[PDB]
């Protein structure tokens, strides 16, 4: 019934980003959200210098058209403190400090050499091939805004400004559990209708690579007091509490009355496949997300719903839903209208060199092998139906969590 | 001179993957290379409905060794009851730089002194690639410091990296130290940004020497060092991080002779097709390219000046940059 776009936008609308912070040294900030605009304590370049390798020159001691010799030499790791008589043209590496009061630099190519000087093989216009102090970064400027996620792009650049640490938002904590006497841990033996608990691992794994703090509480026993106490424990320590399956996502039962008793939580029916059901709302101190028991469903549900929610909570100001490009079906695809279909395909380069998807196989939620063989999602539009080879189709790539 | 493709194949060819292993519970395996084919202890479906074993039949190999394990696979193994699997040990990479010109942060810039950045960047990439980093810091400008470092490093590492400082061709005391502890080539690569790269075998590890310039070093690492670590790690995932074809929404000055790795910004156009746009000045004197950008533009080597509308090769950035 409810639209995905609709459900998402309602979830994130109520959410207030964390602002609690902590200062860490640069080598620990990867994936961390900056909390306070990094401000340049210095100018970059710090000094005035030459973009190119050749000869610094003034237009006063050049006009004559006398090939001037060199008085001295500047280097990037070896500056210059000489004189420069009234007729010289100092040599200098690229990046190396321009002599006090130089008005232009000229690279070897625009000059001939001899036993008396450096005949400048072309004209020379002021400011040429001088990189200026602060031209790349001026002191007191903002280099990276708050809410920026730090990677190898930014952190080394902060290292270039002598800043050994920056404040970042604290990691989001996420409590996790599942429930069902039916659920067993590995190494234990499958009893009657008993099955091995898998959503919890998947979710747990996804949280950690999302840079969250996981509080994995295990399987909870099929007992109200056991569950009531799991929520309470989880709520006091988390920003977000996830049920990876077991707890009601709509169906009536003791777990459903426990949710109602501890929080105001919506139970939606979302117009998507795989999946459909989703529990969401506020507990006393955290947000609750409840996934359905089906592996393929809960993954998808989490990746598309819970994942967005965590981004906003985390203080990241990176707006957008993982890039999503248009491409052709090299396969046929049975789509049933009425539901936004997140099918998996395989994005690859074709004979020509253009990208094209291929289905992975049976798109049923009764096998997980899709996520492995696949390397993207094929977002067939809600009212769309069977797709024929050749058509233009919406395709979202897999992020790190898979590939 | 030397060809990237060439230099790449010549490095991977000499590398023998790690085979040493450890057994870890599923929750700690993310990113880790599986060391032994995961075999199904049971039938899936275990019961019957769509009957027992039609998806996964017992004795059947679910995942081959050399597979990197993510949310795709590890949940599937938890379905078979397996609480832990063997993976190859993390790749130990020892790291340092050298040059008195290098200062540490919080201290003041001396004369020609500058802040050591390559080491940070390299240390960062390594950890996210899931290596084990032995960061030995800044080495003093002394041949004995340097000698002592390579030894210390070689004895803990499968791979030793100098993020800068140690010669990559130019003749000086550190160059002679390399010839003394190892058989290391000094290449000059047909690429931009950059060019110089040192590579070889110490007594007990491979050495990779990046050049001083930040833009050069990051790129050289990403394009040479990174592949090298994947093979070493025992990953059997073959390929050059996906590289698709797309149009320049922008002009791009490209000189022939060198394979140019410029950065642009891949994005959805009005219609709905992917197109690229340059970041700005493609000089190596600034590092803002890796932030604004979100891919590389691999200008074919002999290619020169591109014009708007042309088909151009584009390799998106991985998680190392977003």
XYZ file of C-alpha atoms in Angstrom:
725
model
C 0.000 0.000 0.000
C 2.293 2.769 1.325
C 4.870 4.169 -1.087
C 8.552 3.619 -0.480
C 9.499 7.217 -1.272
C 6.670 8.113 1.081
C 7.774 5.818 3.920
C 11.406 6.926 3.732
C 10.623 10.629 3.725
C 8.366 10.178 6.741
C 11.065 8.278 8.659
C 13.793 10.780 8.043
C 11.551 13.774 8.668
C 11.184 12.969 12.351
C 14.860 12.223 12.896
C 17.255 14.591 14.485
C 20.965 14.054 13.777
C 23.317 13.296 16.664
C 25.512 16.225 17.630
C 27.406 14.569 20.432
C 31.071 14.573 19.551
C 34.622 13.568 20.276
C 38.069 14.499 19.127
C 40.208 11.869 17.452
C 43.527 11.802 15.662
C 43.332 11.820 11.910
C 44.207 8.150 11.374
C 40.990 7.179 13.212
C 38.493 9.402 11.390
C 37.893 7.329 8.268
C 34.147 7.134 7.742
C 33.601 9.548 10.575
C 31.450 12.680 10.155
C 33.193 16.001 10.817
C 31.364 17.964 13.490
C 33.002 21.404 13.211
C 34.000 23.112 10.000
C 37.732 22.587 9.549
C 39.285 26.058 9.297
C 42.691 26.618 7.735
C 45.245 27.812 10.292
C 47.607 28.576 7.355
C 47.813 29.668 3.698
C 48.391 27.211 0.851
C 50.700 27.476 -0.712
C 52.178 28.953 2.427
C 54.512 30.875 0.150
C 54.691 32.403 -3.304
C 56.228 30.037 -5.868
C 56.732 28.834 -9.428
C 54.230 26.543 -11.199
C 56.979 25.511 -13.663
C 60.663 24.553 -13.873
C 62.845 27.300 -15.395
C 63.829 30.910 -14.740
C 62.417 33.642 -12.457
C 62.684 37.140 -13.999
C 61.765 40.806 -13.378
C 60.534 43.011 -16.247
C 62.943 45.779 -15.113
C 66.052 43.557 -15.475
C 64.876 41.922 -18.746
C 63.669 44.707 -21.108
C 67.188 45.279 -22.513
C 67.112 41.940 -24.338
C 70.419 41.061 -22.717
C 70.656 37.347 -21.877
C 71.000 37.620 -18.075
C 72.971 34.925 -16.192
C 71.848 33.335 -12.881
C 72.848 34.866 -9.532
C 71.516 32.095 -7.282
C 69.234 29.074 -6.942
C 65.934 28.323 -5.173
C 64.550 24.842 -4.498
C 61.382 23.477 -2.848
C 63.373 22.030 0.083
C 66.127 24.655 -0.147
C 65.077 28.349 -0.440
C 67.065 31.378 -1.688
C 68.585 34.274 0.280
C 71.042 36.035 -2.023
C 71.034 39.403 -3.800
C 70.057 39.176 -7.494
C 72.126 41.962 -9.103
C 70.608 44.352 -11.704
C 70.622 41.730 -14.455
C 69.994 38.113 -13.424
C 67.349 35.347 -13.722
C 67.461 32.768 -10.922
C 66.890 29.051 -11.687
C 64.100 27.302 -9.735
C 62.240 24.001 -9.463
C 58.469 23.662 -9.789
C 56.941 24.456 -6.373
C 60.107 26.217 -5.225
C 60.015 29.660 -3.527
C 59.995 32.685 -5.834
C 62.848 35.163 -5.068
C 61.854 38.192 -2.978
C 60.059 40.519 -5.400
C 59.901 38.443 -8.585
C 57.342 39.529 -11.162
C 57.263 36.469 -13.500
C 58.577 32.923 -14.152
C 59.683 31.457 -17.538
C 60.096 27.698 -18.195
C 63.236 26.443 -20.026
C 61.267 25.943 -23.285
C 60.950 29.727 -23.707
C 64.747 30.275 -23.480
C 68.166 29.624 -25.100
C 71.451 29.210 -23.063
C 75.049 30.342 -23.558
C 78.379 31.245 -21.845
C 77.089 34.734 -20.805
C 73.376 34.215 -20.035
C 69.825 33.030 -20.732
C 68.366 34.490 -23.961
C 64.615 34.398 -23.289
C 63.218 32.776 -26.473
C 59.782 34.489 -26.138
C 57.934 37.463 -24.651
C 56.965 37.426 -20.944
C 53.733 38.614 -19.287
C 53.493 39.417 -15.523
C 52.372 36.783 -13.010
C 52.881 33.929 -15.469
C 53.647 30.608 -13.830
C 53.543 32.025 -10.301
C 51.311 30.156 -7.899
C 50.427 32.676 -5.179
C 50.314 32.232 -1.422
C 46.763 31.325 -0.418
C 45.634 30.921 -4.032
C 44.702 27.284 -3.235
C 43.634 27.815 0.392
C 43.482 31.098 2.228
C 43.983 31.115 6.017
C 40.802 31.259 8.070
C 38.868 29.778 5.110
C 36.597 26.792 5.414
C 38.249 23.725 3.863
C 35.646 21.086 4.833
C 32.144 21.743 6.127
C 30.553 19.984 9.102
C 28.744 16.782 8.366
C 31.336 15.800 5.787
C 32.405 12.135 5.762
C 36.163 11.838 5.951
C 38.068 9.564 3.539
C 41.537 9.594 1.908
C 40.273 12.613 0.007
C 40.055 14.946 3.011
C 42.170 13.614 5.870
C 45.532 13.962 4.159
C 44.555 17.526 3.147
C 43.968 18.230 6.864
C 47.337 16.715 7.531
C 48.712 19.387 5.141
C 47.423 22.058 7.490
C 49.208 20.691 10.552
C 45.915 19.719 12.221
C 46.588 16.443 14.125
C 42.949 15.928 15.191
C 39.430 17.024 14.401
C 36.172 16.594 16.251
C 33.664 14.062 14.817
C 30.198 12.950 15.763
C 30.155 9.943 18.026
C 29.372 6.620 16.414
C 25.708 5.756 16.362
C 24.908 2.895 18.638
C 22.565 0.227 17.420
C 21.159 -2.568 19.577
C 20.233 -5.778 17.790
C 18.327 -8.951 18.532
C 16.030 -11.586 17.145
C 13.491 -13.915 18.675
C 11.877 -17.284 18.124
C 12.418 -20.556 19.919
C 12.600 -21.764 16.319
C 15.892 -19.975 15.903
C 19.132 -21.796 16.585
C 22.753 -20.723 16.638
C 25.295 -22.524 14.494
C 26.992 -25.699 15.702
C 23.805 -26.328 17.586
C 21.569 -28.905 15.895
C 18.393 -28.062 14.000
C 15.496 -29.590 15.955
C 11.910 -29.762 14.677
C 10.838 -26.696 12.704
C 14.023 -25.116 14.056
C 16.190 -23.074 11.681
C 19.505 -21.211 11.826
C 19.297 -17.486 12.597
C 20.749 -15.453 9.721
C 19.186 -12.020 9.544
C 20.905 -11.111 12.788
C 24.331 -11.878 11.331
C 23.532 -10.037 8.100
C 22.267 -6.994 9.942
C 25.057 -7.009 12.467
C 27.534 -7.222 9.621
C 25.876 -4.394 7.726
C 25.861 -2.111 10.803
C 29.563 -2.560 11.474
C 30.573 -1.748 7.879
C 28.250 1.221 8.133
C 30.533 2.316 11.036
C 27.891 1.882 13.696
C 28.420 0.518 17.196
C 26.597 -2.799 17.404
C 25.052 -4.037 20.644
C 24.058 -7.568 19.459
C 21.864 -9.014 22.232
C 21.483 -12.486 20.714
C 18.318 -14.516 20.337
C 15.709 -13.666 22.942
C 13.586 -16.497 24.387
C 9.883 -16.794 23.482
C 8.794 -15.160 26.773
C 7.205 -11.763 27.348
C 9.377 -10.933 30.332
C 12.404 -11.922 28.338
C 11.391 -9.579 25.499
C 10.188 -6.629 27.611
C 13.620 -6.769 29.290
C 15.467 -7.012 26.003
C 13.803 -3.823 24.727
C 14.423 -1.906 27.948
C 18.063 -2.928 28.057
C 18.409 -2.127 24.358
C 16.569 1.181 24.595
C 18.698 2.575 27.392
C 21.940 2.009 25.457
C 20.976 2.558 21.839
C 19.944 5.368 19.523
C 18.379 2.696 17.391
C 17.020 -0.698 18.256
C 16.605 -3.305 15.491
C 14.650 -6.526 15.521
C 16.107 -8.680 12.716
C 13.058 -10.889 12.893
C 10.831 -12.490 15.444
C 9.150 -9.407 16.752
C 5.815 -8.644 15.112
C 5.805 -6.512 11.987
C 1.985 -6.240 12.087
C 0.586 -9.692 12.945
C -1.109 -9.734 16.368
C 0.631 -11.534 19.305
C 2.426 -10.945 22.637
C 5.406 -9.328 20.901
C 2.977 -6.906 19.180
C 1.476 -5.875 22.504
C 4.969 -5.343 23.920
C 5.893 -2.869 21.188
C 2.677 -0.959 21.688
C 3.394 -0.962 25.429
C 6.943 0.525 25.095
C 6.599 2.895 22.161
C 4.525 4.573 19.474
C 5.451 2.453 16.397
C 3.823 2.343 12.944
C 3.415 -1.024 11.206
C 3.529 -0.280 7.480
C 2.798 -2.329 4.383
C 5.191 -1.098 1.720
C 4.705 -1.359 -1.996
C 7.880 -3.186 -2.705
C 9.437 -6.502 -3.542
C 11.086 -8.391 -2.177
C 9.370 -7.795 1.160
C 6.437 -5.695 2.333
C 6.077 -5.397 6.093
C 7.998 -2.991 8.320
C 7.645 -1.885 11.938
C 8.855 1.605 12.795
C 8.566 4.234 15.524
C 9.952 5.795 18.714
C 10.756 4.014 21.948
C 11.526 6.066 25.068
C 15.117 6.703 24.075
C 15.647 5.211 20.659
C 14.087 4.583 17.287
C 12.716 1.094 16.580
C 13.055 -0.668 13.239
C 11.619 -4.203 12.913
C 12.461 -6.359 9.928
C 10.485 -9.362 8.722
C 11.731 -12.911 9.112
C 12.466 -13.525 5.441
C 16.191 -13.227 4.682
C 15.907 -11.573 1.269
C 13.182 -9.289 2.576
C 15.040 -8.085 5.668
C 18.248 -7.436 3.850
C 16.484 -5.398 1.185
C 14.196 -3.682 3.734
C 17.212 -2.765 5.860
C 19.478 -1.625 2.993
C 16.769 0.644 1.570
C 15.085 1.842 4.775
C 17.178 1.394 7.890
C 20.350 2.387 6.036
C 19.064 5.836 5.008
C 17.813 6.402 8.544
C 21.280 5.743 9.935
C 22.918 8.176 7.543
C 20.799 11.108 8.758
C 21.260 10.119 12.371
C 25.008 9.979 11.867
C 25.344 13.665 11.000
C 26.454 12.972 7.394
C 25.125 15.757 5.137
C 25.613 13.713 1.960
C 22.230 13.981 0.244
C 21.129 11.335 -2.287
C 20.148 7.631 -2.598
C 23.195 5.669 -3.872
C 23.695 6.798 -7.489
C 21.206 5.150 -9.810
C 21.828 5.053 -13.563
C 19.924 3.999 -16.734
C 20.971 1.049 -18.812
C 19.555 -1.656 -21.112
C 18.173 -5.110 -20.221
C 20.140 -7.803 -21.980
C 17.553 -10.100 -20.387
C 13.815 -10.497 -19.973
C 12.303 -9.701 -16.542
C 8.885 -10.773 -15.217
C 7.563 -7.736 -13.369
C 4.139 -7.586 -11.752
C 2.598 -4.117 -11.439
C 1.525 -2.719 -8.080
C 4.920 -2.914 -6.388
C 8.383 -1.334 -6.694
C 10.640 -4.270 -7.596
C 14.210 -4.416 -6.364
C 15.454 -7.312 -8.497
C 19.123 -8.147 -8.786
C 21.046 -8.132 -11.991
C 24.612 -8.153 -13.213
C 25.996 -4.900 -14.580
C 28.657 -5.537 -17.249
C 30.504 -4.034 -20.197
C 29.246 -5.361 -23.534
C 30.910 -6.119 -26.864
C 30.758 -2.440 -27.894
C 31.729 -1.070 -24.483
C 28.402 0.107 -23.060
C 26.931 -1.181 -19.794
C 24.004 -3.579 -19.701
C 22.223 -5.611 -17.016
C 21.379 -9.305 -17.011
C 19.071 -10.970 -14.482
C 20.675 -13.288 -11.912
C 18.077 -16.030 -12.130
C 14.961 -16.756 -10.105
C 14.075 -13.607 -8.135
C 12.233 -15.414 -5.361
C 12.868 -14.587 -1.696
C 13.477 -18.301 -1.003
C 17.149 -18.150 -2.054
C 19.837 -15.642 -1.119
C 22.279 -16.484 -3.969
C 21.013 -13.400 -5.861
C 23.090 -11.048 -3.685
C 26.246 -12.929 -4.561
C 25.862 -13.391 -8.311
C 24.333 -9.935 -8.624
C 26.248 -6.691 -8.419
C 23.337 -4.225 -8.550
C 19.617 -3.784 -8.130
C 17.138 -3.386 -10.986
C 14.529 -0.960 -9.792
C 11.528 -1.769 -11.924
C 9.039 1.042 -11.538
C 5.906 0.293 -9.479
C 3.256 0.110 -12.254
C 5.699 -1.351 -14.789
C 5.171 -4.900 -16.106
C 7.186 -7.596 -17.916
C 10.359 -6.093 -19.416
C 11.627 -7.153 -22.815
C 15.208 -7.292 -23.916
C 16.408 -3.929 -25.282
C 14.435 -1.706 -22.870
C 15.805 1.100 -20.648
C 15.877 0.104 -16.997
C 16.741 1.725 -13.635
C 19.742 0.110 -12.038
C 21.288 0.820 -8.617
C 24.767 -0.596 -7.896
C 25.745 -2.590 -4.870
C 27.748 -0.644 -2.266
C 30.609 -2.094 -0.185
C 28.256 -4.155 1.960
C 28.289 -6.630 -0.928
C 30.756 -5.365 -3.613
C 58.773 4.917 -20.979
C 57.418 1.728 -19.286
C 53.698 0.840 -19.779
C 51.247 0.752 -16.851
C 49.612 -2.487 -18.109
C 53.167 -3.737 -18.582
C 54.452 -2.698 -15.116
C 51.280 -4.063 -13.528
C 51.506 -7.528 -15.110
C 55.223 -7.671 -14.337
C 54.536 -7.110 -10.648
C 51.630 -9.507 -10.190
C 53.589 -12.178 -12.051
C 56.269 -12.446 -9.386
C 53.853 -12.415 -6.426
C 52.833 -15.678 -4.699
C 49.572 -15.352 -2.649
C 49.402 -15.920 1.086
C 48.300 -19.390 2.177
C 48.765 -19.144 5.912
C 45.405 -19.140 7.645
C 43.187 -18.688 10.684
C 39.714 -19.732 11.747
C 37.347 -16.983 12.756
C 33.707 -16.803 13.675
C 31.528 -15.493 10.822
C 31.052 -12.054 12.395
C 34.745 -11.260 11.987
C 35.149 -12.423 8.401
C 33.900 -9.428 6.467
C 36.459 -8.677 3.774
C 38.447 -11.773 4.528
C 39.519 -14.238 1.834
C 38.143 -17.770 2.356
C 41.004 -20.277 2.521
C 39.053 -23.548 2.006
C 35.937 -24.175 -0.120
C 32.869 -23.989 2.111
C 31.144 -27.342 1.730
C 27.485 -27.854 2.643
C 27.059 -29.998 5.748
C 23.373 -30.212 4.935
C 20.663 -29.940 2.290
C 18.809 -26.723 1.475
C 16.015 -26.766 1.705
C 16.814 -29.014 4.672
C 13.208 -30.213 4.979
C 11.117 -30.322 1.774
C 8.205 -28.434 0.066
C 10.209 -27.538 -3.783
C 12.051 -30.508 -2.210
C 15.065 -31.009 0.131
C 18.377 -30.089 -1.486
C 17.132 -28.525 -4.728
C 18.990 -25.226 -3.997
C 22.002 -26.476 -1.977
C 22.731 -30.213 -1.983
C 24.944 -31.629 0.780
C 28.601 -32.184 -0.128
C 28.162 -29.324 -2.634
C 30.575 -26.425 -2.701
C 28.745 -23.243 -1.822
C 31.759 -20.928 -1.899
C 35.189 -21.550 -3.390
C 38.352 -20.535 -1.599
C 39.706 -17.108 -2.517
C 36.232 -15.628 -2.236
C 35.983 -12.313 -0.379
C 33.112 -12.555 2.052
C 30.468 -9.921 2.580
C 26.770 -9.731 3.413
C 26.205 -11.803 0.303
C 27.968 -14.919 1.523
C 28.429 -14.917 5.296
C 24.684 -15.056 5.985
C 24.446 -17.950 3.539
C 27.090 -19.885 5.541
C 25.210 -19.167 8.762
C 22.276 -20.991 7.073
C 24.379 -24.171 6.952
C 25.098 -24.006 10.645
C 28.756 -23.208 10.186
C 29.892 -20.956 13.070
C 33.368 -20.300 11.692
C 35.442 -20.640 8.543
C 39.152 -20.483 7.735
C 40.450 -17.283 6.048
C 43.955 -16.309 4.974
C 45.774 -14.108 7.414
C 45.714 -10.349 6.932
C 48.460 -8.936 4.766
C 51.063 -7.229 6.854
C 52.345 -3.992 5.289
C 55.054 -1.965 6.944
C 55.067 1.765 6.288
C 57.427 4.688 6.653
C 58.681 7.956 5.112
C 61.917 9.908 5.290
C 63.225 13.482 4.927
C 64.079 16.069 7.596
C 61.931 18.357 5.541
C 59.007 16.394 7.022
C 57.498 17.744 10.225
C 54.746 16.188 12.374
C 51.484 18.004 13.054
C 51.111 20.220 16.110
C 54.735 21.237 15.565
C 55.758 24.336 13.529
C 56.882 24.368 9.910
C 60.606 25.027 9.759
C 62.346 26.443 6.688
C 61.673 24.314 3.580
C 59.842 21.930 5.956
C 56.355 20.597 5.194
C 53.756 18.304 6.683
C 54.057 14.592 5.947
C 50.820 13.607 4.176
C 51.504 10.636 1.929
C 52.150 8.447 4.949
C 48.786 9.333 6.440
C 46.994 8.719 3.146
C 48.807 5.415 2.502
C 48.179 4.326 6.124
C 44.542 5.068 5.610
C 44.102 3.190 2.366
C 45.889 0.148 3.766
C 43.645 -0.186 6.764
C 40.484 0.122 4.673
C 41.872 -2.488 2.267
C 42.042 -4.596 5.406
C 45.787 -4.851 5.717
C 47.686 -4.844 9.014
C 49.777 -1.657 9.127
C 53.136 -1.360 10.840
C 53.633 2.393 10.736
C 57.290 3.102 11.510
C 56.982 6.929 11.224
C 59.509 9.397 9.790
C 63.061 7.994 9.463
C 65.956 10.285 10.171
C 68.070 11.483 7.231
C 70.810 8.993 8.153
C 71.861 5.846 6.204
C 71.995 3.916 9.467
C 68.512 5.019 10.448
C 67.368 3.979 7.018
C 69.295 0.683 7.005
C 67.899 -0.136 10.433
C 64.392 0.666 9.203
C 64.289 -1.587 6.165
C 65.509 -4.491 8.325
C 63.045 -3.778 11.127
C 60.305 -3.464 8.492
C 61.235 -6.414 6.271
C 61.181 -8.678 9.318
C 57.519 -7.825 10.101
C 56.096 -7.344 6.659
C 54.984 -9.037 3.476
C 55.116 -5.629 1.844
C 57.214 -2.620 2.718
C 56.174 0.854 1.511
C 57.971 4.160 1.541
C 55.278 6.783 1.165
C 58.085 9.119 0.248
C 61.637 10.109 0.959
C 63.543 7.042 -0.152
C 64.846 7.443 -3.692
C 62.662 6.207 -6.658
C 65.410 6.636 -9.256
C 67.487 9.666 -8.277
C 70.981 8.819 -6.977
C 71.668 9.404 -3.255
C 72.435 7.444 -0.054
C 68.937 5.858 0.109
C 69.242 4.604 -3.482
C 72.431 2.804 -2.565
C 70.678 1.363 0.528
C 68.037 -0.175 -1.743
C 70.591 -1.772 -4.065
C 72.231 -3.088 -0.851
C 69.265 -4.861 0.843
C 67.255 -5.784 -2.227
C 66.947 -6.299 -5.952
C 64.606 -3.409 -6.828
C 63.824 -1.930 -10.269
C 63.406 1.821 -10.573
C 60.723 2.377 -13.210
C 59.583 5.459 -15.118
C 55.974 4.846 -16.025
C 54.005 6.142 -18.955
C 51.370 7.744 -16.755
C 50.034 10.933 -15.327
C 49.895 11.991 -12.717
C 53.318 10.792 -11.705
C 55.977 8.640 -13.387
C 58.605 7.305 -10.960
C 58.077 4.059 -9.060
C 60.410 1.653 -7.231
C 59.583 -2.019 -6.943
C 61.277 -5.223 -5.840
C 62.055 -7.999 -3.370
C 63.723 -7.526 -0.019
C 64.930 -10.698 1.811
C 61.421 -11.413 3.167
C 59.033 -8.959 1.543
C 58.264 -6.865 -1.543
C 59.185 -3.194 -1.479
C 57.081 -0.444 -3.015
C 58.565 3.039 -3.217
C 56.210 5.906 -4.014
C 57.505 9.330 -5.116
C 57.148 12.438 -2.948
C 54.292 14.266 -4.651
C 50.928 13.561 -2.950
C 48.808 13.356 -6.090
C 51.438 11.063 -7.660
C 51.676 8.837 -4.582
C 48.009 8.332 -3.984
C 47.437 7.483 -7.660
C 50.512 5.291 -7.962
C 49.455 3.422 -4.851
C 45.815 3.029 -5.959
C 46.824 1.816 -9.418
C 49.865 -0.372 -8.689
C 50.094 -1.098 -4.980
C 46.416 -1.879 -4.481
C 46.258 -4.589 -7.197
C 49.442 -6.057 -5.696
C 47.894 -6.375 -2.284
C 44.772 -8.112 -3.675
C 46.799 -10.956 -5.250
C 48.950 -11.220 -2.177
C 45.773 -11.438 -0.074
C 44.573 -14.533 -1.924
C 41.483 -12.932 -3.408
C 40.595 -14.753 -6.657
C 38.420 -11.855 -7.834
C 39.957 -10.958 -11.170
C 39.629 -7.528 -12.804
C 40.423 -3.834 -12.869
C 37.736 -2.064 -10.724
C 34.904 -1.567 -13.235
C 35.598 0.827 -16.071
C 32.713 1.991 -18.293
C 32.405 4.342 -21.273
C 30.676 7.696 -21.200
C 30.626 11.190 -22.733
C 32.655 14.289 -21.765
C 30.353 17.083 -20.756
C 33.695 18.939 -20.547
C 36.791 19.840 -22.563
C 40.078 18.097 -21.458
C 43.699 18.991 -22.423
C 45.516 15.666 -22.820
C 49.065 15.313 -24.075
C 49.887 12.090 -25.954
C 52.661 9.728 -24.796
C 51.376 9.021 -21.288
C 48.235 7.334 -19.939
C 46.456 10.227 -18.125
C 44.499 9.533 -14.929
C 42.450 12.664 -14.595
C 39.512 12.998 -12.192
C 36.029 14.118 -13.031
C 32.536 13.896 -11.659
C 30.234 11.218 -13.008
C 26.535 12.280 -12.786
C 23.046 11.800 -14.270
C 22.304 14.215 -17.111
C 18.966 15.849 -18.041
C 17.903 12.929 -20.211
C 19.060 10.282 -17.731
C 22.419 9.126 -19.119
C 25.742 9.213 -17.332
C 28.170 11.959 -18.397
C 31.399 13.299 -16.915
C 32.731 16.723 -16.054
C 36.306 17.732 -15.173
C 37.046 18.728 -11.610
C 39.163 21.724 -12.414
C 42.901 22.138 -12.863
C 44.338 18.616 -13.300
C 47.657 19.631 -11.782
C 49.413 17.601 -9.141
C 50.119 20.672 -7.019
C 46.678 20.465 -5.375
C 44.814 17.552 -3.812
C 41.189 18.827 -4.010
C 40.621 16.646 -7.079
C 39.941 13.492 -5.014
C 37.170 15.203 -3.033
C 35.317 16.947 -5.832
C 35.853 14.008 -8.145
C 34.115 10.614 -7.894
C 35.955 8.752 -10.686
C 39.000 8.806 -12.915
C 39.086 9.650 -16.590
C 41.494 7.247 -18.187
C 42.614 9.151 -21.282
C 44.063 6.574 -23.555
C 47.832 7.032 -23.813
C 48.215 8.329 -27.388
C 44.974 10.264 -27.181
C 45.286 14.044 -26.957
C 42.928 17.000 -26.373
C 39.342 15.704 -26.006
C 36.324 17.754 -26.994
C 32.848 17.837 -25.509
C 30.626 14.939 -26.626
C 33.463 12.421 -27.081
C 33.361 8.847 -25.700
C 35.882 8.583 -22.847
C 36.966 5.870 -20.393
C 35.889 6.342 -16.798
C 36.790 4.320 -13.651
C 34.732 5.310 -10.609
C 36.372 5.831 -7.240
C 36.033 2.988 -4.722
C 35.369 3.344 -0.945
C 38.899 4.636 -0.422
C 37.477 7.976 -1.617
C 33.692 7.523 -1.185
